[PDB]
Structures are given as C-alpha cells and as structure tokens.
Design an enzyme around this catalytic site. Structure first.
Site, mmCIF file in Angstrom:
data_model
loop_
_atom_site.group_PDB
_atom_site.id
_atom_site.type_symbol
_atom_site.label_atom_id
_atom_site.label_comp_id
_atom_site.label_asym_id
_atom_site.label_seq_id
_atom_site.Cartn_x
_atom_site.Cartn_y
_atom_site.Cartn_z
ATOM 1 N N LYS B 210 72.251 -17.193 5.266
ATOM 2 C CA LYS B 210 72.973 -16.303 4.334
ATOM 3 C C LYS B 210 74.435 -16.712 4.167
ATOM 4 O O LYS B 210 74.888 -16.946 3.038
ATOM 5 C CB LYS B 210 72.858 -14.840 4.808
ATOM 6 C CG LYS B 210 73.462 -13.804 3.885
ATOM 7 C CD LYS B 210 73.225 -12.384 4.366
ATOM 8 C CE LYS B 210 73.836 -11.372 3.392
ATOM 9 N NZ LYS B 210 73.549 -9.978 3.830
ATOM 10 N N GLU B 216 74.298 -22.031 15.433
ATOM 11 C CA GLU B 216 72.908 -22.441 15.691
ATOM 12 C C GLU B 216 72.258 -23.220 14.541
ATOM 13 O O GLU B 216 71.788 -24.357 14.739
ATOM 14 C CB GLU B 216 72.039 -21.229 16.019
ATOM 15 C CG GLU B 216 72.292 -20.590 17.382
ATOM 16 C CD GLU B 216 73.192 -19.397 17.309
ATOM 17 O OE1 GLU B 216 73.019 -18.497 18.140
ATOM 18 O OE2 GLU B 216 74.097 -19.346 16.448
ATOM 19 N N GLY B 271 69.613 -9.815 6.529
ATOM 20 C CA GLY B 271 68.771 -10.789 7.226
ATOM 21 C C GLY B 271 67.406 -10.231 7.611
ATOM 22 O O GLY B 271 66.364 -10.804 7.231
ATOM 23 N N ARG B 272 67.402 -9.104 8.335
ATOM 24 C CA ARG B 272 66.159 -8.476 8.792
ATOM 25 C C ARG B 272 65.311 -7.828 7.678
ATOM 26 O O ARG B 272 64.318 -7.136 7.962
ATOM 27 C CB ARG B 272 66.447 -7.472 9.897
ATOM 28 C CG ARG B 272 67.405 -6.343 9.526
ATOM 29 C CD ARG B 272 67.833 -5.597 10.770
ATOM 30 N NE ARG B 272 68.732 -4.488 10.467
ATOM 31 C CZ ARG B 272 70.056 -4.581 10.398
ATOM 32 N NH1 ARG B 272 70.662 -5.747 10.601
ATOM 33 N NH2 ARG B 272 70.774 -3.499 10.123
ATOM 34 N N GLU B 357 67.687 -3.775 15.571
ATOM 35 C CA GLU B 357 68.930 -4.252 14.949
ATOM 36 C C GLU B 357 69.518 -3.261 13.914
ATOM 37 O O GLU B 357 70.724 -3.305 13.626
ATOM 38 C CB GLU B 357 68.770 -5.646 14.349
ATOM 39 C CG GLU B 357 70.075 -6.377 14.190
ATOM 40 C CD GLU B 357 69.975 -7.629 13.362
ATOM 41 O OE1 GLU B 357 68.889 -8.184 13.203
ATOM 42 O OE2 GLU B 357 71.022 -8.079 12.872
ATOM 43 N N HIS B 388 44.239 -5.805 29.490
ATOM 44 C CA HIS B 388 44.121 -6.494 30.773
ATOM 45 C C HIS B 388 45.474 -6.676 31.477
ATOM 46 O O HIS B 388 45.540 -7.357 32.506
ATOM 47 C CB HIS B 388 43.450 -7.854 30.544
ATOM 48 C CG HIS B 388 42.182 -7.775 29.750
ATOM 49 N ND1 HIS B 388 40.927 -7.773 30.330
ATOM 50 C CD2 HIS B 388 41.980 -7.671 28.417
ATOM 51 C CE1 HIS B 388 40.010 -7.687 29.385
ATOM 52 N NE2 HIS B 388 40.620 -7.619 28.215
ATOM 53 N N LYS B 518 78.434 -13.958 17.187
ATOM 54 C CA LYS B 518 78.783 -15.175 16.441
ATOM 55 C C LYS B 518 80.232 -15.660 16.641
ATOM 56 O O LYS B 518 80.568 -16.797 16.259
ATOM 57 C CB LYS B 518 78.505 -14.996 14.946
ATOM 58 C CG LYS B 518 77.043 -14.987 14.545
ATOM 59 C CD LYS B 518 76.918 -15.122 13.031
ATOM 60 C CE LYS B 518 75.690 -14.427 12.475
ATOM 61 N NZ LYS B 518 75.766 -14.430 11.002
HETATM 62 N N1 LIG Z 1 69.845 -7.756 8.553
HETATM 63 C C1 LIG Z 1 70.589 -8.475 9.533
HETATM 64 C C2 LIG Z 1 69.558 -9.242 10.407
HETATM 65 N N2 LIG Z 1 70.180 -10.035 11.454
HETATM 66 C C3 LIG Z 1 71.155 -10.909 11.197
HETATM 67 O O1 LIG Z 1 72.053 -10.710 10.379
HETATM 68 C C4 LIG Z 1 71.102 -12.235 11.928
HETATM 69 O O2 LIG Z 1 69.884 -12.386 12.629
HETATM 70 C C5 LIG Z 1 71.175 -13.245 10.785
HETATM 71 O O3 LIG Z 1 69.933 -13.196 10.107
HETATM 72 C C6 LIG Z 1 71.344 -14.618 11.418
HETATM 73 O O4 LIG Z 1 72.507 -14.512 12.221
HETATM 74 C C7 LIG Z 1 71.464 -15.713 10.390
HETATM 75 O O5 LIG Z 1 72.809 -15.735 9.893
HETATM 76 P P1 LIG Z 1 72.866 -16.480 8.484
HETATM 77 O O6 LIG Z 1 71.524 -15.981 7.761
HETATM 78 O O7 LIG Z 1 72.994 -17.901 8.658
HETATM 79 O O8 LIG Z 1 74.095 -15.909 7.807
HETATM 80 O O1 LIG Z 2 45.449 -8.621 35.477
HETATM 81 C C1 LIG Z 2 44.187 -8.709 35.487
HETATM 82 O O2 LIG Z 2 43.495 -8.631 36.508
HETATM 83 C C2 LIG Z 2 43.416 -8.960 34.229
HETATM 84 O O3 LIG Z 2 44.279 -9.634 33.315
HETATM 85 C C3 LIG Z 2 42.257 -9.875 34.539
HETATM 86 O O4 LIG Z 2 42.826 -11.125 34.887
HETATM 87 C C4 LIG Z 2 41.336 -10.039 33.350
HETATM 88 O O5 LIG Z 2 40.598 -8.826 33.268
HETATM 89 C C5 LIG Z 2 40.408 -11.248 33.476
HETATM 90 O O6 LIG Z 2 39.100 -10.938 33.983
HETATM 91 P P1 LIG Z 2 38.492 -11.680 35.301
HETATM 92 O O7 LIG Z 2 39.644 -12.523 35.837
HETATM 93 O O8 LIG Z 2 38.145 -10.573 36.279
HETATM 94 O O9 LIG Z 2 37.298 -12.421 34.744
#
Ligand SMILES: NCCNC(=O)[C@@H](O)[C@H](O)[C@H](O)COP(=O)(O)O
Ligand SMILES: O=C(O)[C@@H](O)[C@H](O)[C@H](O)COP(=O)(O)O
Lengths: 556, 556
Positions: B210, B216, B271-272, B357, B388, B518
C-alpha cells in the site's frame, strides 16, 4: 482442590492483591540496574547456548521466591522423580509417562513393571536407522524397482503434528532425503490432493497410529492402499510401499502390512510426546537418522537439565511458574508463542496440542473439581508477520497476553551478507522493549508537534497514539536452530507443561476429550445416509442434518 | 466509555447477573421443541445456501431481544450507512472505509470528496483482467520468451494474508493457472527457500505494498530483483518479471518498476480488507479473473444482505451480538474459528488479523479509555485434526471458548463415493452436540459398566470421564466452498467485526500498533553492527543484544 488450600499459594495471592500497582516495568528497570542478570538464565548445551531472559516479566525478587516456594510446597521435585523413574503417574489410564526414556542417550535403566524399557527402545531405533539408510540410499526399491522419492505420513494429532512441525523446522537438513507429505484430516481433500502429486512406483506410505483403530488414519490408509493397488495390481507390493508405526501388532497384520514393516512403540508414549519414538520415522527419513539422533540428544540434555538443576535456576521450572503467576493471579486465559523463525511456523501449533491437550483439565488426582484456573489457550504465528496483525491487540487491546518471543542468533540462510537476519533480530528486540516501556501521553504529544499538527487536530488524535506499555515478555534466544537445539527447545516446553500440571494437581497425560471424540461420530454416521428426515437427536443437530441432506444434490 | 453508560447494555448486564444459572442448553432444547427454527438463519444467495445455526448458544428469546435493542441503542444502522455512503468513519486517519466499493457489482455510485470512486475501481479491475488473460494464456512472455509458470507475491500482513488464504481455499479452481508463492517474513528463509525453487525466465514477481515503504516487503523485493538480474543481466527485463500493487506512484517508479506495471488502490482500502482490491491480483492470476469476479460478487451479496436486512434476522449482526454477549457479560477472552475444510487451513489465521487488528483497541471515538472489554483473541485450526488436540481444553478445561464450526455440504473431492465427506460431516455434527449436552456422572457410570470394570477401578476413573457440557457453538453450513461462497463468508465476518466495533465505540479501521512496529526497529538496527557492548537501552534489551553479538561468532 489441593492448590487453593496450599499455604504458599495463598501467600502469593495475598502479595498480588496488595502490591499489584507497584509492579511497573519501566520503574523496575531504572531501579535495579542489574535486573537482567537477576532475572535471566544462560544455558550451555555444548551444541549451542540458550538465553532465557525473563526480566521483562511482572515479577520482583519476592515474587520469584514465593513461586519457587510453591514448587517445593506442591512437590514438583518428587513428582519429577516419579516420572523419570518409570512410575505410573498417568493414574487414570494406569500407564507410565516415559517420553524421556525414548531419548535416553546415557542408556541408564528405566524400570516399568520390573523390566528395563531401554533395550526395546534402542532396538526400534536400530530398526529405524537401518530402514532409513536402506530407503535414503536406494537399497530399498519399489515394486517396479524404483528408488523412493516420496514419503507420506498418514496419521492424525500426536501421530501427525510432531513429525510435521520437526520436518518443517529442520527443512535445510533434508538434502538427499525424500520429500515428506502429511495426510491427517478425514477430509478427502487432504488425501486426494496428495495422491494426485505422487507416483505409486516411488512412494512410501507410513501408517502412524498408536491404537491402529482411529477412524481418520485407517480410512486414509485404506484409500491410499486402494489407490496404490489400482496401479500395482499385486498384493505382495504392499510390503514394499507400506509401513506401520503402532503398539497393536494384531491390527497392523490385519490391515495387510508385513509384520517386519512395523516399528513399535509403547503405551507410556503419549501422542503429544511421541515424535521422539517410532512416530518420528518420517523425520529420520527426511533429514537422516544422524540428525534424528541429534534431536533426541538435545531433548536428553534438557531432561538432564530439568532433573539436576535447583528449582530457582531450572529453565522449564521458571517458565512454568511465570505461567502460574499470570493464570492463577492475573487471570490470563492465553499464552502466546511467537517464534521469529519461518522454519518454526508450526511450532506454536504443536504446543497448542502439547499444552492444551495436557493441562486442559478440571478434575484433580483425588477426583475433586478444581476451584482455580488450569491450562491456558496457546496460540501464535511467526514474527515478523504478527507485528502487522494481532500485535495490535497485544499493544493496544484490553486483554493481557504473556508472550514468549524466540529467535536463533544464526540463520540457516545468511543471504545479502546477513541483512535479512539483522532486521529480524532488530525487530525481535524492539518489539519486546516497546511492550515493556510503551509511549506516554507526553511522548506522543511531542512527536505529533514535530511532524506538524494544529492544537485542535492533535488533541483529538493524541489518546489513540498512546501505548500504555507494561506487557510481559520472555525472550528465548538460542545460537542456531539445529536438530539438537530444537530437541532441547521442545523438551523444555514439555517439562514446562509437566511442572504446571503438578502444581494444579491434574493429570497432564490423560486425554478424555479426544477419547470421547473417537466414539461420537458413530451415532450420527448412519443417520446421514438417505433423504429421510432425522428427529432422533436434539433440535439443532436434527435441523443441521436435514439441511445437509437437502443441499446434498443442489447444483451450484 | 459510552457503552457502559448505555441503558440497554445495563439492562443486559442485569439480566445476566440474575438468570445466568437458568441458561442450560439441555434444559432449553427439550423445553422449546422448535428452538432451531427460533434461533437459525437460512440465507439463499442463488449461488448456494448458508445456514447460520446459532441455537447451540447460551441465549433465550429475551436475551436476543435485548441484544438487538443494544444494536439500535448504539446506532449500528446509522454507522453502517456512513460506511457504505463513503463517509470518513476512520476518523483517526481521516479516511473513508470502502472495501464494499471494491466489490460493488451494481456499480451504484459511492462518493468520496464529491467524486465517484467506482470508475477508478472498475478501471483497475479491467487492467487486472487483461493482465491475467495475457499471463495465463502465454501472451505475456519472459525475457527469454518463456511463458510464466510461477507467480510470486512479495508483501506482508494485509498485503499477504488475504491472497494467501484465498488461493489456498480455492486451490481446485487453479487449473491452467501458474503456481502461487507467498513471501512475507523479513526472515531470509522465506525469500531464499522460494527463489531456490524458481527459474527467473518463467517467474513473475508482485510487490504488494500500500505504502511501498515497508521494510520487510522492500528488502524482500530488492533481494528478488538482485536474484533476477544475476541471471538476466538486463535492467529492461525487470518490466517483464516485476509488477507492483500500490497507492504510491512515486515510490513504485523509484524502485525500477515500469509505471504501466502498477495496479492501483486507495487509502480507504485497509490492508486487512484489501484482498478485494489490486492486492488480489495473485488470486486472479491463480484461479482466473472470472473466479475473482465471483469472489467479489459473493461479498457483494453479503454487503447487500447486511445493508438491507432487519437487525434481528441479519447474519453479521447476529454473529457480532453473540460475541458481545460472551465478551462483555461472560468475560470470554477468546473466540475459536474451526472450519471443517482443509482448503480453509488459513481461514482462522486470516481473521486472527482481521478481527484482532480491528477490535484490539482501548480508546473510544471521543478519546476516553474504555471501562469494558473490547475484541477477543481469535484462533483455530481445521477439523477434524483439532478434536485430537486442543478440543480437550474446550471439552474439559476451565475456560469458556465460544466456537464457530463451519463446513461445506458438497466437497471438492468426493472420493470413495463420498465416504470421507460423510465422516467429516458426522464429526462436525457430533462435536457441536457433545459440547452442548456432555456426559453426566450417571451416563459415564453406565458406559464403564458395559465395557467391563471393577467397582474399585470404575469409581476412581469415573469423575475423569465426565463432561460438564453447556459449551456454546455456531454451526455455519454452506452448500459448497466456491469462489462466490467464500466471498460471502469472508464479507460476513468483515461486517461482524464492524458491528462489534461500533457497539464498543472504537475505530475498527486504524492500526496504531502495527504503525508503531514499522518505526521501532530503526533505533536498534545500527547498534547490532560490531562486537562492542551496548548500554544505550534498558538492562533487558542491552543484555539480549550482547548475547546475540557473543553467539554471532560461535560455531555449531
Ligand atoms: N488494515 C490494516 C491491515 N494491516 C496492515 O496495515 C499491515 O499488515 C499492512 O498490510 C502491511 O504492513 C503492509 O504494509 P504496506 O501494504 O506495504 O503499506
Ligand atoms: O494427542 C493425541 O493422543 C491424539 O492426537 C492422538 O495422537 C490421535 O488420536 C492419533 O490416534 P492414535 O495415535 O491413537 O492412532
């Protein structure tokens, strides 16, 4: 609950209620010139250093003393010994808790039911090593005699998130290893979009499942087997492209997997602590068994550090106690883990399982309900990305979030003569600082005046650009993210969780909610077939099913 | 704050304090047989249906009435009109808030400073369409005359997360489109691991920013440009492989990007909320401009639904008000978004930025500090994986977490004759139900007896397998996840956020926090060079830098 009854806990609650307002970070740092020294831990692993800087926290000399006192009072050291000695501390299931045994490089005996578990631990590792060396070189061939280019792990939860996070974290160490794929969700998208990218001639499937009964894993495993046999047409070829990681020998053979293609583990290996066991075969295939040994060795160092270090200088102990201080006194529902590392994108997610699945409890060791807060909601995303997003609520929201900032000093990619990492480091430092100090009403006023603003516009905009500060951080800095260092870091948090659960008097090693989840979708499952209306459930569930049945054939 | 002073808010707080204990979901569902009908919304978009089932929530007829009353009392409808009419509701920055304009398919005029923004909106879209058609076909060639196979977006935050989430969500619509890559982090890992996979002859770079000043993005952009010119050796080829998405025309030309390679947007595009604008060029390149039109059309439908529907039947309005009810009465710090869809893995993360945000604020429209809770911590991971893991703390923890469960009825991959989706649907239904009803002491006892357990072992294990229940869910079911439906779903939450911020009397469209971030790195950046000790900062920051400087020259 036993915790609310404890004398040291009540002493801590009483101090908090009297001296809360006097805990100001800016006021404390210019009062105690050596606050960093008084509130930080330098750990030398001989394979890199770890600085655990907890000085940006809302604690004084007295608070840390009382927190250490609570650890003694709740019997943390005694409980620790019970775990490392092989005692059945998972009382609800009648199991030992020995993830520490899986990485025990010393080979010192650990006795479960009068028998040393270590020879069986080392035997599976030897079988892992041989298998990896065979697959990674080209010795293990496919059904058409082609070398394995693709490794696919089929498993969910603990049989998934550990190896996923680790293979992502140790990606630059995967040179000359096959590509790793992780299928977990029942959602046919996951398995379908994967198989569309693989060739069955050069693909190895790993069926990671402790019980070998789990619906998601078994269904996904059956689909892959059906997909493989559609091109191979030979049932004998399954022994070349399918392996299993399980405790259940009968279920593995029943599935069609060769009994020599099974890599065993045990019931004292919890899912969320299983990456170290046979579950980590995908890791060992990706980066090699040497790097997998280094991973276990790093965890071993941290286990030894946890076991031998006095509580006031013990890393997982201090991190755990700062947690108790914010949860049971400040009332913080959440805990943010913010790694300044793109390889660690799944790190926060792994401990979202690790912490929340362990300390998300309400019943004590005796059986009585808790009258205090237990485990927090753990979340986070890597830096710097978060600064441009949710950090807004951290800096200017209405909720207190204790954050763990983590960063390696050395980068795996020192491109542009270290320019990118220099900025990353600068941002890491500046953010923890800003959360601590903030920006006052006067500091904001002076900045707006120098830029150029009228007294009518400046005063309206003034409170919106003001940062209250006084937000706590832990800064965990390590030399480099290597297999060893990752092992130490993961194990550090593992014991952090352990210490917290002992203070809360809960079982950090049962998972009755996930056990419930594995049975629930069997009552609803047959009621979905057909076009007939459902009334066997409550108004919500019924209505939902009837909507699904309606929208089933609808053209969009 | 103005909210605590409101008469309808105080009426709602008084009801909650008196009738909290009488709010039991099991008790309510067998009392009101048509509770689903009384607490659900069926929305027909003509491109799929959306069922918003909010009946599993802790509300009665009276509570919804009072919540609707608060929406009127805080002036939600008036504020809504101010946004859609083009008024400067982002008071702190002196900007309009018109993400709704970017997707305005009706082409009805929206006036900013007495001029229609729509002709300029549609002009950028036409330029987008042409560019996409040129790149996707093969008309736009590389410096060696090769067709673009890889598209790379360089941007962070709002210039990243939107297109990332959408391209991931609409992956099966990307047939005959180039691969999309997303470089965001300053961490050299991100840019380095990407460039190692690309060929500069067939790669197009998009510099999404923007302001076009962000450290970055600019640093990552310069690295890629340097990487490209290392193989090309011609400055003229940059006009073939580099494009920009910005508001700042001077900064774009200064970077070396051809002025005809810039895709404009405006300051009233936050941005968002920017994915809809030129920021979504990566989306339009991946799945085509036709699907990108469908995305905007879906959002448009939801904007129109939000604007024209009475508050008591309005989708984003009702979802927002349930949020207020849990945050400002129940005290809930968190809100979980749990999509039962693998394409929606970044959905929860996008709204972690979107919600936090926006509503992570503490200063009102007047300038006074709030004496109530604002925006929650938003988090989640796709189902079924979460069952799980963290669902343990949802089912048996000590923290209340209102959840949003989301699922398409139709799957993009109906493999095994719809077997996988059937289980996914079954799990979706069973989990929301279990959270509502639970498992009593008697229900748990009967289950343990049928399996086979002694009276001594059964009674010790009994309280640990008991589920209290009474945990609220929203079940959002939609026909299929298509470009259109995603647009509607994203826009639904966008306005959900908007309504919440109006009730809280905060600016949902400023980001002092991220704007602070920033500028912060500038002070620490030069102090990192060299081996000399730093004392210019506080004890913590100083110590951290000196540790970094020390571990810089360690070898591991
Ligand atoms: N609606 C605001 C969302 N959040 C932000 O402003 C920052 O994540 C923004 O998107 C980034 O900082 C990117 O900046 P630029 O687009 O290069 O100017
Ligand atoms: O944290 C846990 O125990 C679960 O994520 C299990 O790992 C998941 O249910 C996988 O099943 P199992 O490992 O018993 O085959």
């Amino acid at each position: 609950a036993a915790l609310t009854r404890d004398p040291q806990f009540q002493k801590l609650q009483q101090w908090y209620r009297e001296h809360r307002s006097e805990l100001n970070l800016r006021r404390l740092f210019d009062a105690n010139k050596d606050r960093f020294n008084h509130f930080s831990l330098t750990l030398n692993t001989n394979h890199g250093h770890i600085l655990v800087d907890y000085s940006k926290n809302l604690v004084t000399e007295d608070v840390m003393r009382m927190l250490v006192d609570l650890a003694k009072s709740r019997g943390v050291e005694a409980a620790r010994e019970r775990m490392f000695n092989g005692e059945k501390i998972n009382y609800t299931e009648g199991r030992a808790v020995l993830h520490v045994a899986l990485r025990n490089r010393s080979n010192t005996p650990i006795l479960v039911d009068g028998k040393d578990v270590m020879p069986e631990v080392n035997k599976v590792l030897d079988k892992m090593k041989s298998f990896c060396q065979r697959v990674r070189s080209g010795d293990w061939k496919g059904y058409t005699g082609k070398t394995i280019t693709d490794v696919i792990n089929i498993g969910i939860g603990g049989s998934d998130l550990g190896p996923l996070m680790v293979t992502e974290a140790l990606k630059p160490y995967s040179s000359g290893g096959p590509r790793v794929w992780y299928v977990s969700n029942i959602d046919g998208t996951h398995i379908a979009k994967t198989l569309a990218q693989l060739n069955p001639e050069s693909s190895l499937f790993i069926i990671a499942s402790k019980t070998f009964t789990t619906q998601e894993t078994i269904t996904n495993a059956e689909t892959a087997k059906e997909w493989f046999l559609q091109a191979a047409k030979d049932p004998s070829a399954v022994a070349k492209h399918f392996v299993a990681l399980s405790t259940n020998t009968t279920k593995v053979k029943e599935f069609g997997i060769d009994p020599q293609n099974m890599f065993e583990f045990w019931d004292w290996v919890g899912g969320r602590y299983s990456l170290w066991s046979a579950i980590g075969l995908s890791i060992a295939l990706h980066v090699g068994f040497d790097n997998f040994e280094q991973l276990l060795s790093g965890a071993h160092w941290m286990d030894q550090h946890f076991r031998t270090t006095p509580l006031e200088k013990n890393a997982p102990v201090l991190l755990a106690l700062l947690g108790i201080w914010y949860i049971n006194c400040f009332g913080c529902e959440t805990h943010a883990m913010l790694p300044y590392d793109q390889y660690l994108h799944r790190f926060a997610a792994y401990f979202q399982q690790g912490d929340m699945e362990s300390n998300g409890k309400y019943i004590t060791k005796s059986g009585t309900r808790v009258d205090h807060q237990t485990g927090p909601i753990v979340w986070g995303e890597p830096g710097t990305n978060g600064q441009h997003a949710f950090y807004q609520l951290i800096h200017q929201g209405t909720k207190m979030i204790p954050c763990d900032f983590l960063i390696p000093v050395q980068t795996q990619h020192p491109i542009r003569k270290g320019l990118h990492h220099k900025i990353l480091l600068a941002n890491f430092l500046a953010q923890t600082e800003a959360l601590m100090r903030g920006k006052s009403t006067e500091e904001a006023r002076k900045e707006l005046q120098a830029a150029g603003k009228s007294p009518e516009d400046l005063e309206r905009l003034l409170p919106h650009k003001v940062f209250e500060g006084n937000r706590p951080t832990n800064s965990i800095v390590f030399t480099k993210l290597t297999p060893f260092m990752l092992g130490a870091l993961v194990a550090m948090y593992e014991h952090k969780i352990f210490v917290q659960g002992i203070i809360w008097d809960i079982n950090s090693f049962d998972q009755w909610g996930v056990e419930l989840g594995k049975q629930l979708a069997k009552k609803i499952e047959p009621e979905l077939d057909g076009s007939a209306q459902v009334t066997s459930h409550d108004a919500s569930t019924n209505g939902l099913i009837n909507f699904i049945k309606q929208q089933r054939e609808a053209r969009v």
